[PDB]
Design a protein around this ligand. Structure first.
Ligand code: DHE
Ligand code: DHE
Ligand code: HEM
Ligand code: HEM
Lengths: 551, 559
């Protein structure tokens, strides 16, 4: 229950926590909580505990806390245990994990009562929230603004419920668009015309980059808690569909790529792959799109299932449910775009799926604690050949896995090397075909100096001889020149040409933040982006690199 | 207005066939707490109400009370209605269950109050049943290696009949030519159906309580060689029938938990469990209790065909790879129940009973091909009846529970294009309450029962149509009425005749004369060529005979 560098990345269901709940009756031997006491405890539970234990308390990374188990433990045990607090959430907006004596009582009593399941969110609810602001027939037939769309960057202004569209060459903020609250990621249609953003509360906004003044042409709510979205990327299916994944309800939704009309909702509730036991809360994590078949690649966390969903027929729906490893989170395709490599983070494993054949290929331990690749980093190692890399939240290690079964059979799907970067708390590793450098952040590191810097390895100098490759440390936060707080540097993202890499210097909402652009060839500071509108910048997504999956 | 119960809860000929979860009802449950404004029930009182609910109400309203054919009765809804309304409504009783064993639907004043109070309380979900639970129940009595390598008894296995002796939880293996009860086997609780492996060697039976038994017909004395529990309430089972996959797998479907399980065809080892919880096909709303109904096996692909009732989805599950599981979830129609393959074994035709529709799936292409209203009320085909109509061509027939109609649908898209998947004719048989229609390739007759008809004369008889005399003139073909119950010579009670089943040669058809467990029942064998009584099977052991399955016709899907 203490704060580890690799346990702060748990889901904070703060949007779901806003829903009022009715206090249940208490069975013999259990004391009931008033509506207010219960609601106060429920809000705390959803915001700080549900991530590890589940809203239904059936367990996730943390064990189940169902009434039968908790009642056996007793109020005294629960009270004493909860007194120590709980793991802190993500920095800047997350919880501290500290509880008062009054709250420790509410929490202990709450865990002894029978929880209700939060409301479902189906077609009727989605269609009611579905709004087409600009019908397809009323949209332009060609780009009507003069922006360089493919070099645009879509930046999340987290706490402001907005995104900034920034010119990748001039660094001018072309526009700031409202979305509501905390967009998690931006994804582009295969043609690069449509920008899709998903907010943590399940709201999806679709933006037409071809309009003279790009704006939301359609919006829809697909759940109460969501983190993922993706577009159809199979040749011939450009702009056909979009898909969104939710934590609650546990489901994914395929929507029309032009109107956001909800077409197919699929529940992810089901059996765990290994112990084959029913799990009522299998959250949808990363969602990618196949380049080999007209399918979406969906990670189902708690059950350890990777779904290949064929979108050529939504009525006679074909899917391949792949038994993988529990706690699937993020991942990416290799350089050839044929293999999906994903982190089963809590189990320190990388799962590899062949998207052409639709089958599991390998599962390997990285030797590190809690791999968190984001989409990862693909590059040609001088000795090993094609590899994909990931850093870790739990330690300072960077692991490389071979990704070329045809040309380098002996290295394929094997962890070829592991070496240290700046320190623990890493979230994103990055490179680009035109770059000779491998960038690794350390966002969640407890040391300000480290969390504000980035490690950079020279791929060309890598020998794979077993020694630890040296790295240059870029003082990103220092380059941004921010006085107050301990801003955290996060997520490298390259421009279309792969000549410049951007990083977010993430500070609190009422504090100063910035984006730092680094000249990839020289590893020197290129530009510092600051604007009063740039509030809590986090995710950044270059249109071209996102639409083509170039990483 | 509570007086609305007079119609909503009235017993009809077509509303007595909803599930009775009497096995799940046996589990003792703790009383939940009662929130403010609600009076609590003691553990004893709550358990009593729970048992009644699972036995008489859960079929229509759901174990979780989220609604099935009947509306949801969750605490949020019932509390708004209030105790007074519920008490008054429930006082009128509820629809009766199936004959002989079903509920009367009558409640005492004490019980009515227990039910009203029960509905105001928050129900807990019954226990799940996963791999750990299944493996704990898994027992292999005779390892494959120790079984015979050839038939060791002298029985004509293909002409054998596996008959459900319902209430006793037994099955009688009866010789198809001598009519001798070769053996009566015990499985514990009520067996719903018998299915045969593709080779015809293994007999699989599914108990309503979720118990699966596998019987080796090659043993000198056939007995259960392996058993396993796959849930708390189950009604379906099937074997792999794709060429090259003989004896490879068995699959069982459950009402609770909502799931299906693929097992090893030789040992019953549980291999893959799949939850059926999901979204309804049309309104796309989450349903927490989608029951698995009929399960058939594809002859065109190595797949099982699974009907998921409340969500209206037909699943085509590919068993060639259980790790990288390929399935096709076909949006069909809600309330899918029973069905069968056409004569060519390519198309699955199934009844979405509560909606009076027949759904047709192309098992080769793995897609929905048609949905047609039968024009009748509550179609209940069983596996149906396929035959080449003299003027219409290949057709599949179904009778109805809600009326006396028999509907024919064309099943030949290539050879009789205009007639394909269209209701070609509809005509009356004996009366409403029909459950099974039957024919065989070697017979020119179509048999139709009327099991649930309120009139004894009708419920104890069968209508027989002469397929050869059928024209396409739109008029109603005549039928001969066979007094099956009368032929059986049974005095006490009103036994009901149910389900025709042919012998291997298709020269004789059997019917069950179904009476109560403490009453006399019988099996009646009719000579198909003459439509005359051939033989009556009576035995003190023949208690509550219902489903009958001929080994050959079942293993080959000949109907
Ligand atoms: C499932 C998931 C994905 C994969 C998206 C996809 O494939 O489309 C993802 C990706 C991401 C990516 C993707 C990067 C990429 O390059 O693909 C980014 C930038 C990101 C910024 C953040 N994430 Fe993320 N994130 C979660 C979930 C996820 N994050 C959480 O549940 C968690 C731990 C807590 C929560 O309740 O949200 C969490 C906190 C954060 C943050 O605090 C970050 C740093 C800032 C923010 O804006 O909230 N997450
Ligand atoms: C899901 C299902 C099937 C499909 C089987 C398959 O494809 O493997 C089926 C088939 C059947 C078939 C299949 C016949 C065939 O030729 O395929 C028969 C004989 C049959 C005899 C009965 N059924 Fe059945 N039956 C149910 C469910 C089902 N019945 C119920 O839920 C119900 C309504 C009440 C209950 O709680 O069980 C019920 C009551 C009955 C009876 O009362 C019958 C008449 C006597 C008995 O033994 O219980 N059901
Ligand atoms: C949030 C305030 C919160 C509560 C409440 C909570 C409770 C809780 C209890 C009572 C236990 C004891 C379980 C037992 O049977 O002994 C327990 C145990 C663990 N928890 Fe927890 N927990 C809260 C929050 C969190 C968070 C944010 C995490 C995940 C980072 C988490 C994790 C765990 C883990 C791990 C355990 C130890 C046992 C195990 O599952 O290995 N909890 N929690
Ligand atoms: C079992 C004894 C049983 C109970 C209890 C029960 C309750 C119940 C209530 C309180 C209503 C009224 C709800 C309202 O007005 O909102 C209600 C309504 C219907 N029921 Fe029922 N019911 C019990 C049993 C059964 C059975 C066995 C069936 C199915 C054959 C059934 C069906 C219905 C139907 C139909 C209605 C009317 C509303 C609708 O869903 O159309 N009930 N029941």
């Amino acid at each position: 229950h203490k704060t580890r560098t690799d346990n702060r990345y748990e889901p904070s269901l703060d949007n779901l926590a806003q829903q009022d709940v009715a206090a249940p009756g208490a069975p013999e031997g259990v004391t009931a909580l008033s509506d207010a006491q219960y609601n106060e405890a429920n809000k705390i539970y959803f915001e700080r505990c549900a991530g590890c234990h589940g809203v239904l308390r059936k367990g996730a990374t943390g064990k189940a806390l169902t009434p039968d188990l908790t009642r056996d433990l007793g109020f005294d045990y629960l009270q004493s245990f909860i007194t120590y607090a709980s793991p802190a959430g993500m920095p800047n907006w997350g919880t501290s994990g500290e509880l008062s004596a009054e709250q420790v009582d509410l929490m202990a009593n709450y865990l002894l009562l029978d929880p209700a399941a939060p409301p479902e969110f189906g077609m009727k609810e989605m269609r009611e929230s579905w709004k087409v602001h600009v019908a397809p027939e009323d949209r332009p037939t060609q780009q009507m603004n003069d922006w360089d769309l493919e070099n645009l960057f879509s930046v999340t202004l987290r706490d402001a419920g907005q995104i900034a569209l920034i010119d990748g060459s001039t660094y001018e903020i072309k526009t700031v668009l409202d979305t509501g609250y905390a967009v998690h990621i931006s994804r582009l249609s295969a043609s690069g015309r449509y920008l899709f953003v998903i907010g943590r509360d399940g709201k999806v906004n679709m933006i037409d980059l071809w309009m003279k003044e790009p704006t939301t042409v359609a919006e829809i709510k697909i759940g109460s808690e969501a983190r993922s979205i993706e577009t159809s990327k199979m040749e011939g299916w450009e702009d056909k569909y979009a898909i969104a994944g939710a934590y609650w309800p546990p489901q994914y939704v395929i929507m029309d790529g032009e109107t956001l009309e909800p077409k197919k909702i699929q529940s992810t509730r089901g059996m765990t792959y290994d112990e084959q036991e029913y799990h009522p809360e299998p959250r949808v994590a990363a969602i990618l799109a196949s380049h080999y078949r007209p399918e979406f690649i969906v990670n189902v966390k708690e059950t350890g299932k990777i779904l290949l969903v064929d979108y050529t027929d939504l009525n006679n729906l074909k899917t391949t449910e792949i038994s993988a490893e529990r706690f699937l989170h993020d991942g990416g395709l290799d350089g050839s775009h044929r293999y999906f490599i994903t982190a089963a983070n809590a189990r320190n494993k990388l799962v590899v799926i062949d998207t052409k054949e639709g089958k599991l290929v390998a599962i390997e331990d990285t030797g590190g604690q809690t791999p968190h690749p984001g989409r990862g980093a693909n590059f040609v190692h001088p000795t090993f050949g094609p590899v994909w890399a990931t850093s870790h939240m739990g330690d300072d290690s960077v692991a490389l896995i071979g990704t070329d079964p045809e040309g380098h059979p002996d290295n394929a799907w094997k962890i070829l090397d592991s070496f240290p970067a700046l320190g623990g708390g890493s979230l994103f590793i990055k490179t680009h075909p035109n770059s000779q450098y491998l960038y690794v952040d350390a966002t969640l590191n407890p040391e300000a100096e480290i969390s504000g810097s980035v490690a950079v390895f020279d791929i060309k100098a890598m020998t794979g001889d077993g020694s630890d490759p040296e790295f240059k440390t870029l003082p990103i936060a220092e380059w941004a020149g921010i006085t107050e707080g301990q801003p955290r540097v996060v997520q490298g993202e390259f421009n279309k040409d792969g000549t410049e890499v951007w990083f977010s210097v993430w500070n609190g909402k009422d504090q100063e933040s910035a984006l730092v652009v680094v000249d990839d060839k020289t590893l020197e500071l290129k530009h510092v982006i600051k604007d009063e509108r740039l509030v809590t910048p986090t995710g950044k997504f270059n249109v071209y690199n996102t639409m083509t999956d170039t990483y």
